Each structure stands twice: as structure tokens, then as C-alpha cells.
Amino acid sequence: ASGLMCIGVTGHYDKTLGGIDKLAIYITPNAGSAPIDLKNAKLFLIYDGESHVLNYSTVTTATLGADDIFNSSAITDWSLADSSSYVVGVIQDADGSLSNGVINKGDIAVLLVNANAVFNKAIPTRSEVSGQFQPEFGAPAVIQFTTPAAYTQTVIELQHHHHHH
Amino acid sequence: ASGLMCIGVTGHYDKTLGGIDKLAIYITPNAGSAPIDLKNAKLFLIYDGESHVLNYSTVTTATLGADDIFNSSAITDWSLADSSSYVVGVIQDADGSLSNGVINKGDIAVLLVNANAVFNKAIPTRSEVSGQFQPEFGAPAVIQFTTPAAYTQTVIELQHHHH
Ligand SMILES: [Ca+2]
Ligand SMILES: [Ca+2]
């Protein structure tokens, strides 16, 4: 029984857009999982009366060891997070497997999503977001959060889990 | 300034089909909400790599006072819960509003969903189901449950009331 767990979601608040414009969904394998290929994995997100399906665009190691994973100067592959695609950032990967789109024991990946582009607007306060990240094989990671009623800083913890990023 | 809350989800376990074949999703308005029209409301469900949308069909009062919410002999409008439609049952109402698809203060409605029809199989053990019930106006009710590791009884409480 292999599968993926969501270990957190953070959002970027852009005050000029009035909301959360970008999401970072942190993923790790279930304890004891076999390796899982991410390359055909689909991200399903429901928001505001629409369901969206996003596909794998590419992977980048530019996120590795970085405090700011929302910055498109430092992580230029944000340019590929569009209305129908996510980018995978490497967070932790001892053996390098994520650079071939394979997540294995101990790995942490982040799914970079341009919510402004997917939803055609930034996500306002008190908004419900629901979703699953489903690779071809194994069980899915689950996304559920309600954005807070006030956005007070640029990086917002949306879904809290324990596992380190 | 209005919305719906999911106050729970139960499911029916069918041994012949090998899992949960029906869901009952219980809804009530958020405190302070204005009346909400359900007639154009959509139910979005994600399970096993597919996203499904279900539309409003009809509303039944046959669910009022029914101790078995899954009995399609008693609640004949279960026949209209198919791969693309849910049915609304009235559970609590004091002004008849739900009889014409409007939910208002103090009301509880149930959404009857034929999971077997929607997903083309019964929901097996250890499954993740995520969803939202979104009327045209107001904030949505949220569905999120993990089916248990074994099905030990006919009716399973899948999701509970949270604050
Ligand atoms: Ca690895
Ligand atoms: Ca009423």
C-alpha cells in the first residue's frame, strides 16, 4: 500500500491582487511506500464552483534549502505554473530520484501552483479549497483548507501538518 | 453573507458490491445566513483520480422522520440518484422552504448520492473522498472523509460535525 501524504500547504499573499495568488503543496510518501512516479500524477482542486485538473509541467532543484519558494527571480520555473499545470520543487531528496520525477522514501517535494492563473483571480479571505494529488499508482495526498479571514503577511500557513519542509 | 456547512456524512455498506454504495451528506446553513436556493447547486466529488459533478434532481419529504435514510423502497427518489444527480431530502424544516429547494435558518437537508453510480463501483476501504457542495450563492459545504479499514456494519459514520 504505497501512497502520498500532504504535509502542509502555504500560500503567497499579494496585496495588490487582494488575495492568495500562489500555493505551495508539500508532499512526502506514506511511511513504507514503494517508489512512486510523479510524472503522470494529477492534481485536482475544487474552488468557487469549479473543479480543475493540473498536470506535471517539470521539476526544479532551485527550491532546495530555500526559505522563499514563491520568488520567480530565484525560481524562474514559476513561469511554467500556468492555468493547467503544476511545477515540482525538490525540498529533500538524498538519492536524486525527484530529478527523474520519482519520489521515494524520505523525499519531500513541493507542488508549485499559480492560483491566480488556475482560478483566474487571487483567492480571497475565508475561501474553501479542496483537492487530491493522485499519481497513477497508489493512494493520494489530500488537500483541505479554508483561507484565513485576514491576510497579515506575505507567506501564509494554510494547512498545517507536523512533518518538516 | 451566507453559506452552507456539512454537519456530517454517513454511508451504506453493501456486501455484494464490496463497499459503500450510497452516501447521505447532511447540510445546514451557517449562522446568520440568508436563505439559499439549492436548485442550481452543484456537488463536486473527487475519488480515485476522477472529479465528478452532480446536479440537483428533486426534493423529497420521504426522508422526514425516516430511521433508514438508505431504504430505496421507502424513499423512492433514491432512483433519481444516478451518476450525474443527487437528491435532496428534507430532514428539518419549519416553513416549507426546502419543499421548493430553498434552505434557511434552522433547516437540515440531506443529499442522497449513489456512490456506485457515480464512481462505477462501490467505495472500498481506506479510500479518500473530497468534495464541495456549492450553491450559486454563498460559501460551500465541504466533504472530506477516509473510509474505514473494514466495513463492520451496514451504516457507517464517515464525517462528523466539527467547529
Ligand atoms: Ca529520493
Ligand atoms: Ca425552512
UniProtKB/Swiss-Prot annotation, chain A:
One annotated GO molecular function: structural molecule activity
Residue stretches in coiled coil: none
Cellular component terms per the entry's GO annotation: archaeal-type flagellum
Alphabetical keyword list: Archaeal flagellum
A GO BP annotation: archaeal or bacterial-type flagellum-dependent cell motility
UniProt similarity note: Belongs to the archaeal flagellin family.
Protein name: Flagellin B1
From Swiss-Prot, chain B:
UniProt record similarity statement: Belongs to the archaeal flagellin family.
Gene Ontology process terms (BP): archaeal or bacterial-type flagellum-dependent cell motility
Residue ranges the record marks as coiled coil: none
Main function: Flagellin is the subunit protein which polymerizes to form the filaments of archaeal flagella.
Organism from which the protein derives: Methanocaldococcus jannaschii (strain ATCC 43067 / DSM 2661 / JAL-1 / JCM 10045 / NBRC 100440)
Residue numbers of the full-length protein present here: 59 to 217 of 217
GO molecular function, one term: structural molecule activity
Protein name, as recorded: Flagellin B1
Principal location class: other
Subcellular location: Archaeal flagellum
A GO cellular-component term linked to this record: archaeal-type flagellum
UniProt KW keywords: Archaeal flagellum
